[PDB]
């Protein structure tokens, strides 16, 4: 009843581009305790990626402006720190959702890699704006969530599984952008790409379009990071 209503509201909110509404509705579905279906899991992920993404995008614009007038620079810091506070509230809600509901209520290996990769993602977004001891904490938790998700995927999923591929794509981005290590980044990405291509027979009718798309994104990232 309320779940089906909330999912419809989330669908209407996404159409109306009101992604804060969409995240709120999908948050309520998650807090009802049940394991999210594949449609619900996608709705929640799309909602919060739009919600956190708006603040990441705003933060980046202000950051470039800051770097490019004593009182103006002082003001740029305050508006950026306002956005950073918003960023942390969004990530902490999502990471709470993961640690109380999504991850523990995750039963099959595929969902566990999905939600652990999510935890690494949102800890990574914190690391983009974090500082000091908080940054070292977020970086460690992000890297650890990615690594644990990575080990499960190597043991339970084919190299062409879109969740395994998208996990490798983001883990490589974590090495490039959060740590200052372009070589691991390029190293992880190529390996991931090469294993998927080495196993092109594993592509399945349900996601070959998604598998190939992420394979192409790994390649695009590799070109950008070497050209």
């Amino acid at each position: 009843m309320d779940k089906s209503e909330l999912v419809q509201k989330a669908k209407l909110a996404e159409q109306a581009e009101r992604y804060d509404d969409m995240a709120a509705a999908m948050k309520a579905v998650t807090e009802q305790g049940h394991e999210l279906s594949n449609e619900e899991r996608n709705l929640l992920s799309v909602a919060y990626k739009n919600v956190v993404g708006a603040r990441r995008s705003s933060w980046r614009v202000i950051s470039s402006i800051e770097q490019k007038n004593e009182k103006k620079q002082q003001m740029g810091k305050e508006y950026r720190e306002k956005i950073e506070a918003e960023l942390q509230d969004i990530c902490n809600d999502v990471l709470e959702l993961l640690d109380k509901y999504l991850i523990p209520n995750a039963t099959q290996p595929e969902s566990k890699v999905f939600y652990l990769k999510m935890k690494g993602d949102y800890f990574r977004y914190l690391s983009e704006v974090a500082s000091g001891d908080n940054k070292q904490t977020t970086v460690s938790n992000s890297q650890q969530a990615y690594q644990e998700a990575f080990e499960i995927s190597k043991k339970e999923m084919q190299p062409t599984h879109p969740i395994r591929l998208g996990l490798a794509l983001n883990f490589s981005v974590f090495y490039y952008e959060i740590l200052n290590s372009p070589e691991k980044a390029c190293s992880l990405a190529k390996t991931a790409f090469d294993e998927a291509i080495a196993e092109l027979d594993t592509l399945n009718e349900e996601s070959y379009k998604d598998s190939t798309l992420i394979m192409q994104l790994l390649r695009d990232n590799l070109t950008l990071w070497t050209s």
Binding site: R60, E177, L213, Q216, L217, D220, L224
Partner: peptide, 20 residues
């Protein structure tokens, strides 16, 4: 689909320019 590839390229590009 080419939208996602273009979106990804622009998001990844900001960091390379921001730190250089």
């Amino acid at each position: 689909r080419d939208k996602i590839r273009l979106n990804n390229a622009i998001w990844r590009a900001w960091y390379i320019q921001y730190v250089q």
